[PDB]
Design an enzyme around this catalytic site. Structure first.
Site, short mmCIF file in Angstrom:
data_model
loop_
_atom_site.label_atom_id
_atom_site.label_comp_id
_atom_site.label_asym_id
_atom_site.label_seq_id
_atom_site.Cartn_x
_atom_site.Cartn_y
_atom_site.Cartn_z
N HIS A 1 0.83 -1.22 0.00
CA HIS A 1 0.00 0.00 0.00
C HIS A 1 0.85 1.25 0.00
O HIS A 1 2.10 1.17 0.12
CB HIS A 1 -1.01 -0.01 1.17
CG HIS A 1 -0.36 0.03 2.52
ND1 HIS A 1 0.06 -1.11 3.18
CD2 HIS A 1 -0.05 1.07 3.33
CE1 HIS A 1 0.61 -0.78 4.33
NE2 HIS A 1 0.52 0.53 4.47
N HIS B 1 0.59 7.86 5.75
CA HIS B 1 -0.17 7.09 4.73
C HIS B 1 -1.02 8.15 4.02
O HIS B 1 -1.89 8.76 4.65
CB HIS B 1 -1.08 6.03 5.42
CG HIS B 1 -0.36 4.84 6.01
ND1 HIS B 1 -0.19 4.66 7.37
CD2 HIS B 1 0.23 3.77 5.41
CE1 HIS B 1 0.49 3.54 7.58
NE2 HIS B 1 0.70 2.96 6.40
N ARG C 1 0.71 15.40 8.32
CA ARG C 1 1.24 14.59 9.45
C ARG C 1 2.24 15.36 10.35
O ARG C 1 2.26 15.14 11.55
CB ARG C 1 1.79 13.20 9.03
CG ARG C 1 0.73 12.19 8.51
CD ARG C 1 -0.50 12.08 9.46
NE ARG C 1 -0.20 11.16 10.58
CZ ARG C 1 -1.13 10.56 11.34
NH1 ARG C 1 -2.38 10.79 11.10
NH2 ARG C 1 -0.80 9.76 12.32
N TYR D 1 9.39 -1.43 0.49
CA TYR D 1 9.96 -2.41 1.43
C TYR D 1 8.79 -3.21 2.04
O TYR D 1 7.59 -2.80 1.96
CB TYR D 1 10.73 -1.67 2.55
CG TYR D 1 9.80 -1.09 3.59
CD1 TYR D 1 9.59 -1.73 4.82
CD2 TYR D 1 9.09 0.08 3.32
CE1 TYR D 1 8.70 -1.18 5.75
CE2 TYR D 1 8.24 0.62 4.21
CZ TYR D 1 8.04 0.01 5.43
OH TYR D 1 7.10 0.61 6.25
N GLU E 1 4.68 -4.16 7.81
CA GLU E 1 4.48 -3.08 6.90
C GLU E 1 4.93 -3.54 5.52
O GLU E 1 5.89 -4.30 5.36
CB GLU E 1 5.19 -1.84 7.37
CG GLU E 1 4.34 -0.95 8.33
CD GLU E 1 3.34 -0.06 7.58
OE1 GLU E 1 3.03 1.04 8.03
OE2 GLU E 1 2.86 -0.42 6.49
N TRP F 1 12.37 0.74 8.02
CA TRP F 1 12.33 1.65 6.85
C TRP F 1 13.36 2.77 6.98
O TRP F 1 14.02 3.13 6.03
CB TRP F 1 10.96 2.22 6.56
CG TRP F 1 10.35 2.92 7.74
CD1 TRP F 1 10.48 4.21 8.04
CD2 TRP F 1 9.58 2.32 8.79
NE1 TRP F 1 9.79 4.51 9.20
CE2 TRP F 1 9.22 3.37 9.68
CE3 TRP F 1 9.08 1.01 9.03
CZ2 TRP F 1 8.40 3.16 10.83
CZ3 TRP F 1 8.30 0.80 10.19
CH2 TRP F 1 7.99 1.87 11.08
C1 LIG Z 1 6.86 4.01 6.84
N1 LIG Z 1 5.47 3.69 7.19
C2 LIG Z 1 5.43 3.09 8.53
C3 LIG Z 1 4.53 4.78 6.79
C4 LIG Z 1 3.94 5.53 8.01
O1 LIG Z 1 3.82 4.75 9.24
P1 LIG Z 1 2.98 5.17 10.58
O2 LIG Z 1 2.91 3.91 11.35
O3 LIG Z 1 3.62 6.43 11.14
O4 LIG Z 1 1.53 5.62 10.03
P2 LIG Z 1 0.41 6.63 10.63
O5 LIG Z 1 1.03 7.92 11.14
O6 LIG Z 1 -0.56 6.90 9.45
O7 LIG Z 1 -0.21 5.77 11.66
MG LIG Z 2 3.22 8.61 11.50
MN LIG Z 3 1.57 1.12 6.27
#
Ligand SMILES: CN(C)CCOP(=O)(O)OP(=O)(O)O
Ligand SMILES: [Mg+2]
Ligand SMILES: [Mn+2]
Length: 176
Positions: free
Chosen positions: A29, A66, A80, A101, A111, A158
């Site tokens: 995703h 995301h 964010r 990844y 993930e 990541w």
């Molecule tokens: C690299 N990935 C984890 C993308 C974002 O990850 P988060 O776990 O921070 O996502 P969110 O802030 O949307 O919960």
């Molecule tokens: Mg986040």
């Molecule tokens: Mn994710």
């Protein structure tokens, strides 16, 4: 919130509710990562809250997330940053547009992401949202890349994979 699902060719196939999408077998995703730098050129490293579902309590790059339907990656970065860190930023810059990844956390949440990487400078003071961030540090980029090369398991997968890409590392440096 949702995530945008993707096929092997990186073509959107639909969406799933964000929390439910991350499991032992997370479908590919859309995500982003951003490396935030202050006026002094110091990187913001963050420790994710203990309440995060995936990698809770883990040290990581500044802000990740995301993108939602109809949002550009860069607007996802901005939203964010305000949401997690309370902070305004310069227009995010592309650093590693083709990062993708898959990884498993200590409790087995995966993930699985097409995860473009960005960089920006902060333009206001942090105001930390402790539902997202439990700890942060301003530091020297080179210090952080040395910790990453020496003790990768101390950081998010990541972050390590991003920072270990030759070109991605060179762009992050140049950025500072
Ligand atoms: C690299 N990935 C984890 C993308 C974002 O990850 P988060 O776990 O921070 O996502 P969110 O802030 O949307 O919960
Ligand atoms: Mg986040
Ligand atoms: Mn994710």
């Amino acid at each position: 919130e949702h995530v945008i699902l993707l096929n092997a060719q990186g073509v959107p196939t639909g969406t799933l509710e964000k929390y439910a999408a991350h499991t032992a077998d997370t479908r590919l995703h859309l995500a982003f990562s951003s490396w935030l730098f202050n006026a002094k050129g110091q990187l913001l490293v963050t420790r994710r809250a203990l309440s995060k579902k995936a990698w809770p309590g883990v040290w990581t790059n500044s802000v990740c997330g995301h993108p939602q339907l109809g949002e550009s990656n860069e607007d996802a970065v901005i939203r964010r940053c305000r949401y997690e860190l309370g902070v305004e930023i310069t227009p995010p810059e592309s650093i590693y547009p083709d990062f993708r990844y898959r990884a498993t956390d200590p409790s087995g949440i995966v993930e699985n992401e097409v995860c473009p990487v960005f960089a920006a400078r902060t333009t206001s003071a942090l105001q930390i949202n402790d539902d997202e961030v439990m700890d942060y540090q301003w530091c020297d980029l080179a210090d952080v890349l040395h910790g990453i090369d020496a003790t990768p398991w101390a950081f998010s997968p990541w972050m390590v994979m991003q920072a270990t890409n030759r070109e991605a590392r060179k762009r992050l440096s140049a950025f500072t």
